[PDB]
Amino acid sequence: LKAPVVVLGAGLASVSFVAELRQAGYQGLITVVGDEAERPYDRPPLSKDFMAHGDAEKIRLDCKRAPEVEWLLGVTAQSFDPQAHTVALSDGRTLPYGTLVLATGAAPRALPTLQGATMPVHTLRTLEDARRIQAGLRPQSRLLIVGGGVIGLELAATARTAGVHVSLVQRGPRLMSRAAPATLADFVARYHAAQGVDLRFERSVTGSVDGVVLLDDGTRIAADMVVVGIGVLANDALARAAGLACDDGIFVDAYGRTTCPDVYALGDVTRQRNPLSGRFERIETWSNAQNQGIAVARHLVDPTAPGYAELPWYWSDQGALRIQVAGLASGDEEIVRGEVSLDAPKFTLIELQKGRIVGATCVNNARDFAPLRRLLAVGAKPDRAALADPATDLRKLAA
Amino acid sequence: LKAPVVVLGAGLASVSFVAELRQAGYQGLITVVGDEAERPYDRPPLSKDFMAHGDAEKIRLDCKRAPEVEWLLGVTAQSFDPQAHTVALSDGRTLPYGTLVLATGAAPRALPTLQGATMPVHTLRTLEDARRIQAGLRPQSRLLIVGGGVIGLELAATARTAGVHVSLVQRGPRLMSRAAPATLADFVARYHAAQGVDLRFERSVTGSVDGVVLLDDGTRIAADMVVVGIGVLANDALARAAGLACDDGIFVDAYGRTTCPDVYALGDVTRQRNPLSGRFERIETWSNAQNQGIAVARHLVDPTAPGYAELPWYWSDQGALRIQVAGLASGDEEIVRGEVSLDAPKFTLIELQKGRIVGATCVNNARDFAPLRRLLAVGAKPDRAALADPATDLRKLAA
Numbered sequence: 070l071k072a073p074v075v076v077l078g079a080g081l082a083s084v085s086f087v088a089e090l091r092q093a094g095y096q097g098l099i100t101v102v103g104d105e106a107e108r109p110y111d112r113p114p115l116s117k118d119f120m121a122h123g124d125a126e127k128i129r130l131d132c133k134r135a136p137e138v139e140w141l142l143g144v145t146a147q148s149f150d151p152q153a154h155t156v157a158l159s160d161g162r163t164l165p166y167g168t169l170v171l172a173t174g175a176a177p178r179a180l181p182t183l184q185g186a187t188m189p190v191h192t193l194r195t196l197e198d199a200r201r202i203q204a205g206l207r208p209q210s211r212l213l214i215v216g217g218g219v220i221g222l223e224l225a226a227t228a229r230t231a232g233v234h235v236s237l238v239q240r241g242p243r244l245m246s247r248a249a250p251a252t253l254a255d256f257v258a259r260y261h262a263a264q265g266v267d268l269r270f271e272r273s274v275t276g277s278v279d280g281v282v283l284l285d286d287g288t289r290i291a292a293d294m295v296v297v298g299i300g301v302l303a304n305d306a307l308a309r310a311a312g313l314a315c316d317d318g319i320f321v322d323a324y325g326r327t328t329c330p331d332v333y334a335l336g337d338v339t340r341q342r343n344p345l346s347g348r349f350e351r352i353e354t355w356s357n358a359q360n361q362g363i364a365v366a367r368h369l370v371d372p373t374a375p376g377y378a379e380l381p382w383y384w385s386d387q388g389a390l391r392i393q394v395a396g397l398a399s400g401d402e403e404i405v406r407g408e409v410s411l412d413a414p415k416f417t418l419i420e421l422q423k424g425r426i427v428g429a430t431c432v433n434n435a436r437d438f439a440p441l442r443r444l445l446a447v448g449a450k451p452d453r454a455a456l457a458d459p460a461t462d463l464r465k466l467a468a
Numbered sequence: 469l470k471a472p473v474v475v476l477g478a479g480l481a482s483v484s485f486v487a488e489l490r491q492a493g494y495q496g497l498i499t500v501v502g503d504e505a506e507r508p509y510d511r512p513p514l515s516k517d518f519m520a521h522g523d524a525e526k527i528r529l530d531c532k533r534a535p536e537v538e539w540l541l542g543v544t545a546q547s548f549d550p551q552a553h554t555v556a557l558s559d560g561r562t563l564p565y566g567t568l569v570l571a572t573g574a575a576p577r578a579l580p581t582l583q584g585a586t587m588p589v590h591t592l593r594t595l596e597d598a599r600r601i602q603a604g605l606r607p608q609s610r611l612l613i614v615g616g617g618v619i620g621l622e623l624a625a626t627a628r629t630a631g632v633h634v635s636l637v638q639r640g641p642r643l644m645s646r647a648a649p650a651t652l653a654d655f656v657a658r659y660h661a662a663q664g665v666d667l668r669f670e671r672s673v674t675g676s677v678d679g680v681v682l683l684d685d686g687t688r689i690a691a692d693m694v695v696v697g698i699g700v701l702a703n704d705a706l707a708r709a710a711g712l713a714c715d716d717g718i719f720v721d722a723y724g725r726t727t728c729p730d731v732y733a734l735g736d737v738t739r740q741r742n743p744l745s746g747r748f749e750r751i752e753t754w755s756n757a758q759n760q761g762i763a764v765a766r767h768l769v770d771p772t773a774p775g776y777a778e779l780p781w782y783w784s785d786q787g788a789l790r791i792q793v794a795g796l797a798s799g800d801e802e803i804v805r806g807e808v809s810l811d812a813p814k815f816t817l818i819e820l821q822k823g824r825i826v827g828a829t830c831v832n833n834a835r836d837f838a839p840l841r842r843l844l845a846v847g848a849k850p851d852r853a854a855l856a857d858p859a860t861d862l863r864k865l866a867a
């Protein structure tokens with residue numbers, strides 16, 4: 070850890086990082102460069118409570134645990150010179166660094182077919198996005214969402230609840246293709262359909278003409294607004310130009326090291342090792358953003374601390390469903406605790422691979438999720454009849 | 469570049485590297501650690517001329533351009549301590565380093581279903597492999613090859629030429645799945661079939677019983693020997709334990725930097741950026757091994773030198789076919805120069821993507837290959853009618 074410390078990006082990863090630095094004992098300079106002119110804020114309300122109530126001061130990140138940090142807000146880092154150890158800012162200034170940390174997150178993928186569209190076409194990543202979307206969402210408006218991921222589905226539920234007609238187009242055969250078990254996805258589809266979401270599977274957007282959307286089946290949807298949610302791309306441009314190893318994401322080891330000396334990276338912008346699959350992936354979860362930021366910071370202050378080791382997990386609030394997914398989506402067996410019914414949805418999925426717990430889903434069942442993550446974390450091999458038996462208490466099982 | 473320099477591995481990548489270091493001006497210590505007790509040798513003859521003539525002194529690498537290098541042959545590097553800057557050897561010694569270079573290549577993938585087989589089951593990576601295979605290959609023996617890659621096919625051609633009956637099992641629908649254009653693969657299949665190779669597509673090996681092989685269709689093949697050629701895995705174990713970023717291959721930037729300070733990597737062991745596809749891949753070609761070793765060495769001696777920039781390419785001698793493949797296997801158009809016939813095979817493929825040359829195949833046509841690689845290297849967009857016209861001279865076109 071060489072002073073001063075410069076962090077590029079001011080999302081949850083960056084805030085968690087600089088906070089931990091200060092908690093761990095680092096008392097030298099920290100400068101954070103954030104391109105949004107916004108007091109650092111959390112993103113998940115943007116599809117739920119913020120979209121509904123509109124209060125941005127309810128979603129700001131607590132910077133309290135990060136004292137003596139200069140936050141250059143509304144400034145874009147344009148390049149860095151890894152030899153000179155400087156960063157070049159959009160306002161003409163230059164920042165020196167001993168240690169440069171890239172926490173630049175990711176930006177929504179654009180839809181090429183709507184590239185020159187004549188109707189409102191938004192993505193949903195920022196406070197600015199949310200406000201703009203929120204403002205074309207009168208009740209009884211007609212909203213099209215492209216993409217069946219968690220963002221689209223969260224928005225869908227939040228919009229239906231308002232009284233918006235929602236139609237969702239998904240090019241695959243199922244929702245939540247990224248890290249959701251099939252069972253969960255079938256159910257999730259079934260829930261939103263029962264809420265009045267018009268689902269289109271196996272469909273692609275081919276273009277648009279005057280407030281109407283064209284699909285690859287020759288059909289048509291008329292929309293008052295279109296929200297695209299087909300995934301994100303890492304903001305790694307700076308890394309690519311300075312010569313770091315990248316492929317839609319900056320490669321880092323478990324200490325957050327890039328291939329460039331004195332340059333680290335964390336959060337959504339990173340491709341890292343998934344300890345379960347063994348493969349490198351861009352883990353774009355909230356918990357990763359925070360937990361990886363902390364791990365990397367902790368190891369910079371105390372090199373004897375371990376590298377980042379957390380198994381991946383996330384939640385997703387979609388209307389009445391509080392969904393929690395941990396680990397892998399499938400193994401060689403799935404055990405279902407409880408019943409899968411739209412009538413009072415509450416159930417638990419456990420995914421097993423040669424007897425070891427490798428994944429878990431809790432829908433409306435937080436009580437079960439935490440002990441499953443503990444059992445998942447130490448690759449436990451419990452009796453499957455006990456795992457299936459409703460009488461079993463999972464919290465107890467975990468000791 | 470900090471002295472002394474320790475290189476792990478003694479294949480073509482390592483030799484090319486240490487040679488360039490010395491040519492570029494580095495005159496400090498170089499120690500190479502090679503686990504095979506063999507004077508450094510080139511691998512491609514192992515499936516062609518060596519397999520036929522048996523002369524290992526015809527395939528040694530010229531170490532002449534690498535003076536004053538100590539080659540610890542027959543020694544395995546067991547671990548390295550990246551903090552202490554030491555390497556631990558299988559013979560009890562410890563090597564200090566300023567600069568550690570991992571050039572440990574890759575090892576053949578094993579076939580789980582033959583894991584406990586009772587008949588000769590070999591892979592073909594080493595001099596030792598070749599000799600052992602060579603010695604169970606009487607004319608009119610029956611050989612099974614699993615895998616339709618270049619190694620299997622090279623062996624197949626070399627064996628048929630001897631008078632061996634060859635049967636080849638491929639789990640995919642085509643040969644040469646890795647970086648071969650479809651057209652080439654259809655033809656290559658067609659050639660070997662006409663040479664008496666019994667091709668089995670869509671088939672898997674399920675197990676074995678007493679000198680007979682079991683496929684997923686319930687059928688059976690009797691073999692006097694089985695040579696498995698279903699790909700390789702990077703030898704990156706040392707890197708995984710020392711904390712470098714790996715996923716079947718060590719991630720390196722274009723200077724060969726890993727995520728660990730003072731530790732570089734090159735050749736088959738690396739996942740690197742493919743300048744055409746933009747993606748990271750394990751490029752396991754001969755030319756990469758040599759050219760990347762040189763680039764990395766050159767940049768260590770002179771940091772003003774550029775990073776490694778070569779577009780990928782390879783050749784493959786399969787009996788009567790001298791095949792040369794450069795770039796990507798497909799674009800939005802394929803142009804065929806000449807005719808595709810088993811009767812005197814000679815043709816050229818050019819792959820185009822939005823007008824730019826992105827790939828080329830020459831079968832028995834070396835004259836055309838070099839200028840295609842030049843045109844490929846600068847993403848040229850030539851008239852397609854001129855590219856198709858047999859009258860056109862490609863060498864001329866390249867200026």
Ligand SMILES: Cc1cc2nc3c(=O)[nH]c(=O)nc-3n(C[C@H](O)[C@H](O)[C@H](O)COP(=O)(O)OP(=O)(O)OC[C@H]3O[C@@H](n4cnc5c(N)ncnc54)[C@H](O)[C@@H]3O)c2cc1C
Nearest residue numbers: 078080081082104112113146173174336337354355358383
């Ligand atoms: C609508 C929405 C809903 C979500 N809901 C969930 C959920 O249900 N569950 C869940 O697990 N996660 C969800 N996420 C939350 C999420 O995962 C976190 O927002 C994310 O992981 C944050 O990681 P980050 O800080 O690394 O990236 P970011 O939050 O994107 O931070 C990066 C910041 O750096 C900025 N930046 C980029 N380049 C530069 C530059 N050159 N100079 C200066 N600044 C730059 C970016 O503009 C950005 O503001 C949701 C996200 C969204 C958008």
Ligand SMILES: Cc1cc2nc3c(=O)[nH]c(=O)nc-3n(C[C@H](O)[C@H](O)[C@H](O)COP(=O)(O)OP(=O)(O)OC[C@H]3O[C@@H](n4cnc5c(N)ncnc54)[C@H](O)[C@@H]3O)c2cc1C
Nearest residue numbers: 477479480481503511512545572573735736753754757782
């Ligand atoms: C049969 C065959 C045919 C081929 N034909 C072609 C062809 O037609 N065209 C083509 O483009 N390429 C072909 N190749 C050649 C090829 O691509 C090169 O052999 C390869 O790219 C060499 O790269 P390398 O030096 O990085 O790996 P390697 O040659 O595998 O060098 C690595 C060496 O380091 C050793 N090592 C590993 N770990 C340790 C350790 N811990 N300590 C000490 N030593 C260690 C390995 O045992 C190995 O000897 C062929 C290869 C084979 C085997």
